[PDB]
Amino acid sequence: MDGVMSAVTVNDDGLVLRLYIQPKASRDSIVGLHGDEVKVAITAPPVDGQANSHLVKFLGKQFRVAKSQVVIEKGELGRHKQIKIINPQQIPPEVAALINLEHHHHHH
């Protein structure tokens, strides 16, 4: 929106995943990843029970963590999503690109 650039935060417990869920796409594909936001299209119906199931899955699977480690801080009923990964086990490059800083400047 202005000058902040967010989408995820690394606390002292794990990491937060804040993106914009887009249900009724056709396939769980991240084709709307923004430099300041993240837009993923899940192929889940307009109901949470079905979407939420996919949500806890996509992460729980891709992150391989746990459902007890995946806390939805917001999005339960909104396109927005704020999942929290406690005791992370596997972090995809996607979120790593902002944590691993793929940039360099002859730093020591």
Side-chain angles (χ1 to χ4, degrees), residues 7-18 59 63 65 69-71 73 82-92 95-96 99:
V8 38
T9 276
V10 301
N11 309 293
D12 301 312
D13 185 47
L15 64 155
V16 182
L17 246 297
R18 246 174 295 171
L59 276 291
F63 275 70
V65 194
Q69 282 28 70
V70 161
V71 211
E73 272 160 1
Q82 332 196 320
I83 285 169
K84 201 275 124 57
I85 281 89
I86 309 177
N87 191 169
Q89 298 279 135
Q90 163 163 253
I91 169 152
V95 199
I99 291 167

Side-chain angles (χ1 to χ4, degrees), residues 1 8 16 26 28 34 38 40 60 64 67-68 80 100:
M1 321 205 192
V8 38
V16 182
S26 265
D28 331 300
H34 187 242
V38 170
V40 68
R64 280 188 326 136
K67 48 166 270 165
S68 148
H80 336 88
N100 282 29

Side-chain angles (χ1 to χ4, degrees), residues 8 22 24 34 37 40-41 44 53 57 60 62 74 79 83 85-86 89 93 104:
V8 38
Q22 244 297 286
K24 276 87 60 34
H34 187 242
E37 326 294 329
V40 68
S53 291
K57 197 189 196 70
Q62 189 65 261
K74 251 157 178 52
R79 286 113 165 213
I83 285 169
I85 281 89
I86 309 177
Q89 298 279 135
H104 37 277

